[PDB]
Write an enzyme that holds these catalytic residues in place. Structure first.
Site, mmCIF file in Angstrom:
data_model
loop_
_atom_site.group_PDB
_atom_site.id
_atom_site.type_symbol
_atom_site.label_atom_id
_atom_site.label_comp_id
_atom_site.label_asym_id
_atom_site.label_seq_id
_atom_site.Cartn_x
_atom_site.Cartn_y
_atom_site.Cartn_z
ATOM 1 N N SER A 366 -24.181 -42.110 8.276
ATOM 2 C CA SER A 366 -23.040 -41.439 8.858
ATOM 3 C C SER A 366 -23.395 -40.037 9.133
ATOM 4 N N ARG A 367 -23.039 -39.415 10.343
ATOM 5 C CA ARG A 367 -23.348 -38.067 10.703
ATOM 6 C C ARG A 367 -22.029 -37.273 10.452
ATOM 7 N N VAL A 368 -21.031 -37.433 11.336
ATOM 8 C CA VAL A 368 -19.792 -36.623 11.376
ATOM 9 C C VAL A 368 -18.694 -37.495 10.887
#
Lengths: 499, 100, 469, 50, 187, 232, 102
Positions: A366-368
């Protein structure tokens, strides 16, 4: 009876009107049609043919127009009269579609009665600017561990579900819809989702199985299903995510949350591939057009979390990929991945070897999508994401060094992997998942051995509510753990571990 | 059918008027298409292979395909100066450099 | 001049106009079609003659009638430039999308601009420091240097660029230009919010950072001229104002891909696999429009997406010509639990040939490359059997090279959250020192976990304390 | 019950072909001619009002 | 650009011809002569109409051309040069193609409008006149524009009628409507 | 009548030009009258101006340009019934097995539209089998489709045979074995073997019907045997 | 020294390295940068050769670096395919060999 239904129909039609322009077709077939005339037509207009079939204007040329046929070839014939609908290609939007099965045209195809609509809005639209956007804050709950907060998704995310097709790919998605049923009947309208499950390229038989399954699980009264099945021709499959997504946006600009699942975007690419080649456009890299990218990026950015102005609306997305054997050298998978943020890499090898869900966590990121989770669900899962990517390295060399510390990690890690598993089509509640991840994160799977993990789980939950439900009322309402609550849980978990 | 200089209305209108001389076929010829970094000229039937032909916008460009339809002249510059209808005059010298 | 026309056709998103008078525009002039919707700005790319041009469409072609008016502006699409372009977001038609209204300007300029000649050249190539370890050692940035990163998002293409802004942009000072060519919508909004929070841009105060962002729901012709719009703004700063600047570009694969989509439609026969025939000329203009002049000096960092991780694909190949340093980030290395994901064997800088980074720095980096290349060579033998079924010397070599690979992971500082480890800012000066010790066996005697997600020299020591307990 | 269900299906097709017979009966009669005049006066009212 | 577009589909010849002839003023005159030279080709029954598929050379086609200008002379001088162009491209079967296009273009500038009124029966003159009146009233025919209404008998319409002209149509046919109605009445 | 003269034979693609008010639809059957048989052409495109483009069901070799074609008005109509069970049939609907004619009862078009949504399986119904090994480890279903793997001539052919016998006991049902691109030597063996083990008979009514499309027949006839068996 | 397809910045570093090393006295740079069209890029090796045949003729010795002939084919590809000439192999026109060998 049989006389009455016919008498009704014949009276509900008259089919006498006065027309503007017409064409008479030039030479029709191959899922694309060539029409002669149509000199005042606008672009992407809807035309209706004398067959009854309708098409969307694609090429407007100085003497002829080349429509694309929404329907099988055989009905269209040469020398038929084509009349302008006079309106741009649209699909009905409104809340008279919830629990009505539809195709991509918006027709009731068994239906649950005819179709009622607030509005219609154009199949193709372009998503709002940069300015009305806001980051996620609210967590999507799947009711399955390994995504719960281990690999987080939030409300407005575009986080991907990737794996090899028909490894149980569909169930992971249903659970999202199912698990949201007690937050979807709330009095918090931001918490409700209205979900659309786009079935593109699947068997009409599966979809009928899916419609019934949801009505047993009592969840079809807050979901729509869209259909462009395998039987139904390619240009309708192409248009299927676009048309459905207009319906999704209607919920999103009323400032309420939604979801749309695009199964399978690899099949949208095929649908669009066939239409593209028969129009004489030369294949790109991996024999798929080079304009495939355009469809997915335009499509995907109409699912986005909006700001306070737009009613802090959202339309979340879980796009479902058919991978070519776990290869990510292929064009279509990477195109969906580079537009999106987050991946839910899923393993066939793992699915077979009794891990249901088989959500590998090594190539899942997961990034953002990591600011979705409220505090309880940041505390409990704390650094479990990290620990099981120390576990991967520990097992590469467990075919160098063998130490208690490495062995201890490996034992925790295996035990932890077992723990992630949960029954499918009854997704365990979020409040219920919060204690279970605490235990394992706090290393309390040094007293439980692998065979007994399932047994401990239910007996530990039963124990906790009857002993102290105070702890659980707190997490239902507050959704944030305090140190004191945390300690109280630790004290309770160790008590259960001994005996 | 397929492009020949009878599929372009500016060439053909004049042909009907019995002008097919007027020395648009000697040392000059009139541009008919421009874009993509390529040019094409109508005329140029005293052209030599590999020659330089000066476009009347101060851009000179060499010619690598000779056809009686459209002699295909490759540009050494801008497409924003070279534009259609203009005349081009054959330099009469193949491309060359100072040696010394 | 005013040139009336009507829209004869709309074939694909490459509209054809037929002008109603004998006056004709030049190639790369701009035209507007009037609809109650707004406008569509289209730009002449061919004349097909008989007073029928073919024009690139920077707006989607929905709802276009045949026999509908067009008008000639009389030149290429004109952006607004100025020092009142700062704090702003600019689209492609020179109009805000962050809605602060009409963008104050003195000169409005055409997006295409003839490249700087080979008489305006700075010979500068002075060290600039990144503040990332891997980068300082293997491919240190430069005053004249052009850096490019290739391969698909692993750690997030965008996110890396954010660290770079965090470190380099608060210690370089002055102006910085961001041009994001068909970049995802959500990400631009998060960055805008961060700059105002971190007090870099402020719309109530000064703005020493300027911005250009496009959107990837925009049509292919539009996303191609997002790049040029930023680039016009960049030149103005470099020359007229004469200030030294940065440039960051993310994602410039998207420029090439937008070109490749329009290439078919126009009436072109493209190159093999599918890519455009005009690739070399066009790539040439951009990278010679960012070329240093004898006014100010600029340093650029470019992100390239590869849909197979094959840098032998024709679009990543043409990038290489215009780059003298690279910092390739590979998906493999990210998946293994190493952040950042820099590949260390596909790294280069022009200054790393000799003692252009000083002799000591060159010795440390030269040996690092040798050790990791041996580790890659013995990868088969390791898999097939192991390292104790090798010679004793080799076994050390393998173990040493395993500490190096791990050591390279530096925690991110505007992405501290995302990694999950509090960021380390490890100096150029420190990176040389840390790497020196590690090669001589001075930290190669303590766990491969005291090398997992560490910064400089000090941290390695400190992760031993932890493990011990 | 299954046969009754079928009977509904049977009924639906039976009643179809009867309408196809009457189409043939109408086009056979000089109703073909009495009704083209009707089309004509309807078309006159309509086209007058464009 | 001359008024009224019809470039492409070999209609580029007609456009060129129309404008080239407009500037001397002999478009009617030319048209009359082009139809006439065309008619004496059709009533040539010894391979001047019986062969229009090319298989002739440059030189054998040139002496076929000389034979065509032997028949009558005084067609003007623009359409005599036109013959040459067509000849050079060696298309003898795309001579009548141009003739019809040039006719279409001519009667648009004059303003005479060709329509069609399909039926399966050959309808009265009263009805013809009442339709001609209705069309003239509508925005369909303006002024300085003439109206010709041509009934054809087609088997593919059977009962009812459809008016057609200027790619604008009002369709009160029985045949299309009976079919659509039959379809909904199988449901 | 809708009639036209052949104006091309490019490969197995034969183009027929038709006159005015005489118009095909796509999928119709064209029959070219010949003393060498008949040839069935399927309209697979409209190229306009009253011309078509078709695929053939049989060799195009020896066609003249100018031979009359006649349009049926829709797709090939193949026999159905319990008179079509225990007969080998090529695509066209006629015996290739040479036991005189098949007594026509009803005939039906080879292309038909997919059944309604409410009439697609809404549940899995388990198809009964006498083979125990099959019903445990991979349940057959009435809506499902089960893809055989393994060699050919290794037990597969006999396995196919077995399944027919169970279905007769279980339900009453028949079968149709459709062979696409059939190997004409092997077809004799299987036809003989099927009759002998009594899943086909010359004594009356039969279970399995065979539909065979030889490989020496054009590509089109190979595809269209698959839609022809299914209609039965 | 022949430079086809390269950025001016790169060429600019080389010429300074030569002047320091004392050897821009006798060096000639034929350049056709990448910004500059495909025909000029293509014509660049070839005028470079002619400048050499003069040195070679006169009784002088010189060396020609042709960097790089792979971008020469590419340049030739752009013009040929937009003059619509059939492709050789890989989309590079089949008469590329004649250019390279002469």
């Amino acid at each position: 009876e049989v006389s009455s239904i016919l008498e009704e129909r014949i009276k509900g039609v008259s089919d006498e009107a006065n027309l503007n322009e017409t064409g008479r077709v030039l030479a029709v077939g191959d899922g694309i049609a060539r029409v002669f005339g149509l000199n005042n037509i606008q672009a992407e207009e809807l035309v209706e043919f004398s067959s009854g079939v309708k098409g969307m204007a694609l090429n407007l040329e100085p003497g002829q127009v080349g429509i694309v046929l929404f329907g099988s070839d055989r009905l269209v014939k040469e020398g038929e009269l084509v009349k302008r609908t006079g309106n741009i290609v649209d699909v009905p939007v409104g809340p008279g579609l919830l629990g009505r099965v539809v195709d991509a045209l918006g027709n009731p195809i068994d239906g649950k009665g005819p179709i009622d609509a607030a509005g219609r809005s154009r199949a193709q639209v372009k998503a709002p600017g940069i300015l009305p956007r806001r980051s996620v804050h609210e967590p999507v709950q799947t009711g399955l561990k390994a995504v719960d907060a281990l690999v987080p998704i939030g409300r407005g995310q575009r986080e991907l579900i990737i794996g090899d097709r028909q490894t149980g790919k569909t169930a992971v998605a249903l659970d999202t819809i199912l698990n949201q049923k007690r937050w979807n009947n709330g009095s918090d309208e931001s918490k409700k989702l209205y979900c659309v499950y786009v079935a593109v390229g699947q068997k009409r038989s599966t979809v009928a199985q899916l419609v019934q399954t949801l009505e047993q699980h009592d969840a079809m009264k807050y979901s729509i299903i869209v259909a462009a099945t395998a039987s139904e021709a390619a240009p309708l499959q192409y248009l299927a995510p676009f048309t459905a997504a207009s319906i999704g946006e209607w919920f999103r600009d009323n400032g309420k949350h939604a979801l749309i699942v695009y199964d399978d975007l690899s099949k949208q690419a095929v649908a669009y591939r066939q239409l593209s080649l028969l129009l004489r456009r030369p294949p790109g890299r991996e024999a798929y057009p080079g304009d495939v990218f355009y469809l997915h990026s335009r499509l995907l950015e109409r699912a986005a979390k909006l700001s306070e102005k737009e009613g802090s609306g959202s339309l979340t997305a879980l796009p479902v990929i058919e991978t070519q054997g776990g290869d990510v050298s292929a064009y279509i998978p990477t195109n969906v991945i580079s537009i999106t943020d987050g991946q839910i890499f899923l393993e066939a090898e793992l699915f077979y070897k009794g891990i249901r869900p088989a959500i590998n966590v090594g190539l899942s990121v997961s990034r953002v999508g990591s600011a979705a989770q409220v505090k309880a669900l940041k505390q409990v899962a704390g650094s479990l994401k990290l620990f099981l990517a120390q576990y991967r390295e520990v097992a590469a060399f467990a075919q160098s060094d063998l130490d208690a510390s490495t062995k201890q990690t490996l034992v925790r890690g295996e035990r932890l992997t077992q723990l992630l598993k949960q029954n499918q089509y009854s997704p365990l509640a979020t409040e219920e998942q919060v204690p279970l991840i605490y235990a394992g994160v706090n290393g309390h799977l040094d007293g439980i051995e692998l065979s007994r993990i399932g047994e401990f789980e239910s007996s530990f939950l039963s124990y906790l509510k009857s002993n102290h439900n105070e702890l659980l009322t707190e997490i239902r309402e507050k959704g944030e753990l305090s140190k004191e609550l945390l300690a109280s849980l630790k004290s309770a978990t160790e008590s259960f571990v001994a005996t | 059918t397929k492009a020949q200089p009878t599929e372009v209305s500016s060439i053909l209108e004049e042909r009907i008027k019995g002008v097919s001389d007027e020395a648009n076929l000697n040392e000059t010829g009139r541009v008919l298409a421009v874009g993509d970094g390529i040019a094409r000229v109508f005329g140029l039937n005293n052209i030599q292979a590999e020659e330089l032909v000066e476009f009347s916008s101060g851009v000179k460009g060499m010619a690598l395909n000779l056809e009686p339809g459209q002699v295909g002249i490759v540009l050494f510059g801008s497409d924003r100066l070279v534009k259609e209808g203009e005349l081009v005059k054959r330099t009469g010298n193949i491309v060359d450099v100072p040696v010394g | 001049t005013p040139i009336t026309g009507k829209v004869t056709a709309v074939i694909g998103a490459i509209v054809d106009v037929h002008f109603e008078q004998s006056e004709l525009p030049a190639i790369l002039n701009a035209l507007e079609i009037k609809t109650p919707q707004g406008k569509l700005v289209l730009e002449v790319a061919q004349h097909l003659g008989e007073n029928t041009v073919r024009t690139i469409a920077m707006d989607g072609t929905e709802g276009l009638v045949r026999g509908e008016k067009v008008l000639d502006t009389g030149g290429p699409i004109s952006v607004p430039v100025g020092r009142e372009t700062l704090g702003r977001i600019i689209n492609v038609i020179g109009e805000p999308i962050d809605e602060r209204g009409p963008i104050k300007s003195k000169l409005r300029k055409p997006i295409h601009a003839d490249p700087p000649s080979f008489a305006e050249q700075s010979t500068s190539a002075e060290i600039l420091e990144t503040g990332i370890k891997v980068v300082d050692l293997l491919a240190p940035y430069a005053r004249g240097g052009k850096i490019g990163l290739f391969g698909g998002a692993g750690v997030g293409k965008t996110v890396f660029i954010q660290e770079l802004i965090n470190n380099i942009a608060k210690a370089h000072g002055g102006f910085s230009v961001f041009t994001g060519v068909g970049e995802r919508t959500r990400e631009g909004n998060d960055l805008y919010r961060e700059m105002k929070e971190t007090g870099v841009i402020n719309l109530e105060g000064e703005s020493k950072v300027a911005l250009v962002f496009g959107q990837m729901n925009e049509p292919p012709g539009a996303r191609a001229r997002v790049a040029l719009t930023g680039l016009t703004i960049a030149e103005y700063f470099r020359d007229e104002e004469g200030q030294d600047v940065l440039l960051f570009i993310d994602n410039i694969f998207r420029f090439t891909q937008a070109g490749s989509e329009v290439s078919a439609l126009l009436g072109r026969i493209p190159s093999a696999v599918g890519y455009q025939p005009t690739l070399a000329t066009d790539m040439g203009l951009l990278q010679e429009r960012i070329t240093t002049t004898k006014k100010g000096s600029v340093t650029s960092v470019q992100a390239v997406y590869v849909p197979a991780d094959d840098l032998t694909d024709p679009a990543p190949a043409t990038t290489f010509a215009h780059l003298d340093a690279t910092t390739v980030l590979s998906r493999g290395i990210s998946e293994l639990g190493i952040y950042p994901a820099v590949d260390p064997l596909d790294s280069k800088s022009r200054l790393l040939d000799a003692a252009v980074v000083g002799q000591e720095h060159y010795d440390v980096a030269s040996k690092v490359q040798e050790t990791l290349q041996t580790y890659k060579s013995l990868q088969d033998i390791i898999a097939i059997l192991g390292m104790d079924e090798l010679s004793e010397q080799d076994k050390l070599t393998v173990e040493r090279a395993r500490k190096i690979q791990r050591f390279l992971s530096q925690p991110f500082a505007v992405a501290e959250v995302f990694t999950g480890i509090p960021g380390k800012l490890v100096r150029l000066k420190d990176t040389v020192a840390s790497f020196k010790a590690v090669l001589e066996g001075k930290y190669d005697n303590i766990p491969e976990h005291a090398f997992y997600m560490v910064g400089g020299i000090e941290d390695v020591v400190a992760k031993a304390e932890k493990l011990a307990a | 019950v299954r046969y009754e269900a079928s009977l509904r299906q049977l009924e639906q097709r039976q009643l179809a072909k009867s309408v196809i017979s009457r189409v043939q009966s109408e086009l056979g009669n000089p109703k073909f001619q009495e009704k083209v005049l009707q089309q004509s006066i309807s078309e006159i009212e309509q086209l007058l009002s464009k | 650009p001359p008024p009224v577009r019809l470039f492409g589909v070999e209609g580029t010849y007609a456009t060129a011809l129309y404008q080239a002839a407009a500037k001397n003023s002999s478009i009617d005159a030319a048209f009359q002569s082009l139809q006439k030279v065309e008619s004496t080709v059709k009533k040539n029954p010894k391979l001047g109409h019986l062969l229009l598929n090319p298989a002739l050379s440059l030189k054998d086609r040139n002496s076929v051309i000389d034979a065509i200008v032997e028949t009558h002379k005084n067609l003007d001088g623009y359409v005599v040069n036109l013959l040459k162009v067509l000849s050079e491209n060696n298309r003898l079967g795309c001579f009548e193609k141009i003739a019809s296009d040039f006719g279409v273009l001519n009667d648009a500038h004059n303003g005479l409008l060709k329509g069609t009124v399909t039926s399966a029966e050959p309808l009265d003159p009263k009805s013809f006149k009442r339709i001609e009146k209705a069309l003239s009233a509508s925005k369909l025919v303006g002024q300085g524009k003439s109206l010709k209404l041509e009934n054809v008998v087609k088997p593919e319409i059977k009962g009812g009628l459809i008016v057609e002209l200027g790619d604008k149509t009002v369709d009160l046919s029985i045949s299309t409507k009976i079919q659509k109605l039959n379809k909904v009445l199988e449901d």
